[PDB]
């Protein structure tokens, strides 16, 4: 799925968590799992990517709003 903007990928699903890497707009990401975290533009859903860090799902163009795949473990 493409990211919708330049999008931070963080060590935890929080906008205060450390930035591991930043994807340039349109970069293809795969979703390992989904969880909840900071509310970003109305969505508290966060996606763990192929790199093991978390992005705000609002900015991942999947067509889905709610969690739709494997839930991340605690
Ligand atoms: Zn930023």
What is d(CA 51, CA 49) in angstroms, rounded to the nearest whole number? 5
Interval between CA 37 and ligand 1 midpoint (Å)? 17
Q: Is residue 1 part of a domain?
A: no
Spatial strand order of the sheet with 7-10 comes to: 19-23, 7-10, 54-56, 43-49, 31-40
Q: Is residue 24 part of a domain?
A: yes
What's the resolution in A?
A: 1.2
CB 10 within 8 A of CB 23: no
Interval between CA 8 and ligand 1 midpoint (Å)? 7
**Structural determination approach:** X-ray
Interval between CA 22 and ligand 1 midpoint (Å)? 8
Q: Give the distance, in angstroms, between the CA of residue 33 and the centroid of all CA atoms in the same chain.
A: 9
Q: Is residue 35 part of a domain?
A: yes
Number of domains in the chain: 1
Give me the domain span that covers residue 48: 7-59
What is d(CA 5, CA 25) in angstroms, rounded to the nearest whole number? 4
Interval between CA 29 and ligand 1 midpoint (Å)? 18
Interval between CA 6 and ligand 1 midpoint (Å)? 8
Q: Is residue 2 part of a domain?
A: no
Q: Is residue 64 part of a domain?
A: no
């Amino acid at each position: 799925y493409p990211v919708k903007t330049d999008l931070h990928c963080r060590s935890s699903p929080s906008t205060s968590a450390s930035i591991v890497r930043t994807y340039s707009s349109g970069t293809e990401v795969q979703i390992q799992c989904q969880t909840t975290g900071t509310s970003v533009q109305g969505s508290n859903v966060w996606d763990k990517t192929q790199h093991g860090c978390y992005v705000a799902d609002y900015y991942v163009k999947t067509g889905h709003s709610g969690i739709f795949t494997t839930k991340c473990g605690s």
